[PDB]
Design an enzyme around this catalytic site. Structure first.
Site, short mmCIF file in Angstrom:
data_model
loop_
_atom_site.label_atom_id
_atom_site.label_comp_id
_atom_site.label_asym_id
_atom_site.label_seq_id
_atom_site.Cartn_x
_atom_site.Cartn_y
_atom_site.Cartn_z
N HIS A 142 -30.39 38.90 -60.98
CA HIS A 142 -31.81 38.61 -61.18
C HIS A 142 -32.18 38.77 -62.65
CE1 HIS A 142 -36.20 38.90 -59.78
NE2 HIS A 142 -36.25 39.42 -61.00
N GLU A 143 -31.74 39.86 -63.28
CA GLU A 143 -32.10 40.10 -64.68
C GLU A 143 -31.45 39.08 -65.61
OE1 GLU A 143 -34.52 41.94 -64.73
OE2 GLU A 143 -34.22 42.95 -62.80
N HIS A 146 -33.22 35.80 -65.66
CA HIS A 146 -34.40 35.68 -66.52
C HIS A 146 -34.02 35.13 -67.90
CE1 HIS A 146 -37.69 37.08 -64.10
NE2 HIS A 146 -37.12 38.24 -63.81
N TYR A 157 -44.56 33.61 -67.92
CA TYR A 157 -44.50 34.68 -66.91
C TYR A 157 -45.89 35.07 -66.40
CZ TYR A 157 -41.99 38.50 -64.57
OH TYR A 157 -41.44 39.37 -63.64
N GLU A 166 -39.86 34.10 -61.18
CA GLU A 166 -39.38 35.18 -60.31
C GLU A 166 -38.49 34.65 -59.19
OE1 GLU A 166 -39.48 38.28 -61.97
OE2 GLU A 166 -39.25 38.51 -59.80
N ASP A 185 -26.69 38.95 -48.28
CA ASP A 185 -27.87 38.75 -47.46
C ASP A 185 -28.90 37.99 -48.30
OD1 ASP A 185 -29.27 40.70 -49.08
OD2 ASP A 185 -27.95 42.13 -48.12
N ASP A 226 -50.17 42.07 -61.44
CA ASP A 226 -48.79 41.60 -61.48
C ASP A 226 -48.68 40.22 -62.15
OD1 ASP A 226 -45.96 41.50 -60.91
OD2 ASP A 226 -46.39 40.57 -58.96
N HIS A 231 -44.47 38.52 -58.60
CA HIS A 231 -43.53 39.10 -57.64
C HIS A 231 -44.03 38.99 -56.20
CE1 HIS A 231 -42.46 41.28 -61.44
NE2 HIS A 231 -41.24 41.13 -60.98
#
Ligand SMILES: CC(C)C[C@H](NP(=O)(O)CNC(=O)OCc1ccccc1)C(=O)NCCCN
Ligand SMILES: [Ca+2]
Ligand SMILES: [Ca+2]
Ligand SMILES: [Ca+2]
Ligand SMILES: [Ca+2]
Ligand SMILES: [Zn+2]
Length: 316
Positions: A142-143, A146, A157, A166, A185, A226, A231
């Site tokens: 995930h990081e 980005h 963002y 995201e 999963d 947020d 998110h």
């Protein structure tokens, strides 16, 4: 650092043993020379000054508790590099083999991880909500995703573009987790979230509403928290991606699944050829339709399934 490539051994956050590519020059450093222009892992030493010091170890064995987040940040960055190179023919996050840098032990009790514009950064968690966050392969991927997004589509963002940003990170985080094929999963962060609670996760792509995130555009958040719900509203796109891959009938709309590999091809092409910094959800739909058309043909099942999935989540 200049030195010779070596192979160390250690234990990650979850207690599992793995080999890690290191570099020897007086000390053994977490510097993997086998991938692009290197993968480098740093110790932030519980502080917030970045990157900290390149991780140095006297004996090339990384079995101390303090070592575990570094072992996993370093190893999972390598897996993520391999996914992008082997599956999408992309060399690191910039496409030209930029060095990949991560810092662990960031701050104290820090329940998050992030890309800061230049590197990845992992907290240790507070031990209750999170354990050290590099323990999750989906988190690491995930990081790094980005960074890929920032070098390609450049999605701003906030608001819908930020929720796409995201979702792209959750999608490729999940596809990397499947690529490595250890307990894969469609949930996000389960391996490092809430050690005292079994069976939960930070987000679900298969059922975003399990954690209060929308699974239909009519349930989108439009307040200011947020960054405008980046998110939260990601759940709408995560659900669409899940449906494209796995199929299902959602709010009465049936989607024929086409599998993970084709999902990844469609979204990688959309991200790198069609999306722009300000793309909204409707523009993502169009980008995914065009990408599937390029890859599989206008009359293909793949195009038809992209349309049904976005219909299912209320995005026209
Ligand atoms: C996958 C999970 C485990 C982590 C994930 N973190 P993220 O999305 O990457 C948080 N990045 C973020 O804010 O970039 C904005 C930014 C830009 C420049 C400099 C700094 C920051 C996330 O879902 N965080 C939500 C809260 C978790 N407690
Ligand atoms: Ca050691
Ligand atoms: Ca898993
Ligand atoms: Ca997962
Ligand atoms: Ca848990
Ligand atoms: Zn993120």
């Amino acid at each position: 650092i200049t030195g010779t490539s070596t192979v160390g051994v250690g234990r990650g956050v979850l207690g599992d043993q793995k080999n890690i590519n290191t570099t020897y020059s007086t000390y053994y450093y977490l510097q993997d020379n086998t991938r692009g222009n290197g993968i480098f892992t740093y110790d932030a030493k519980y502080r917030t000054t970045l990157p900290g010091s390149l991780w140095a170890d006297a004996d090339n064995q990384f079995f101390a508790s303090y070592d575990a987040p570094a072992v996993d940040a370093h190893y999972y960055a390598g897996v993520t590099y391999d996914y992008y190179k082997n599956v999408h023919n992309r060399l690191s996050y910039d496409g030209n083999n930029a060095a990949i840098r991560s810092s662990v032990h960031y701050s104290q009790g820090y329940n998050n991880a992030f890309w800061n514009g230049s590197q990845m950064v992992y907290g240790d968690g507070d031990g209750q909500t999170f354990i050290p966050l590099s323990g999750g392969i989906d988190v690491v991927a995930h990081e790094l995703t980005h960074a890929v997004t920032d070098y390609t589509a450049g999605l701003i963002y906030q608001n819908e573009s930020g929720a796409i940003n995201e979702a792209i990170s959750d999608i490729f985080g999940t596809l990397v987790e499947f690529y490595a094929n250890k307990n894969p999963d469609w949930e996000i962060g389960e391996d490092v979230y809430t050690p005292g609670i079994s069976g939960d996760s930070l987000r679900s792509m298969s059922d975003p509403a399990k954690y209060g995130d929308p699974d239909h555009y009519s349930k989108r958040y439009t307040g200011t928290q947020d960054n405008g719900g980046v998110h939260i509203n990601s759940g709408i796109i995560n659900k669409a991606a899940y449906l494209i891959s796995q199929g299902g009938t959602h709010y009465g709309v049936s989607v024929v699944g086409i599998g993970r590999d084709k999902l990844g091809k469609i979204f990688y092409r959309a991200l790198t050829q069609y999306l722009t910094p300000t793309s909204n959800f409707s523009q993502l739909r169009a980008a995914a339709v065009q990408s599937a058309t390029d890859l599989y043909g206008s009359t293909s099942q793949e195009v038809a399934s992209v349309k049904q999935a976005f219909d299912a989540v209320g995005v026209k």
